[PDB]
Amino acid sequence: ELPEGYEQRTTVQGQVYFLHTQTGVSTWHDPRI
């Protein structure tokens, strides 16, 4: 479970990535971690 504002997307790339676009976050690390 993430904090609010994080879009957890699963791309055909085969990788999970966390999208918080205020600033435009695309990160490998769970922001809850």
Binding site: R9, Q15, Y17, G24, S26, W28
Partner: peptide, 8 residues
């Protein structure tokens, strides 16, 4: 309409 992917 398009988000960016992570570079690994």
């Amino acid at each position: 309409s398009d988000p960016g992917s992570p570079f690994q």
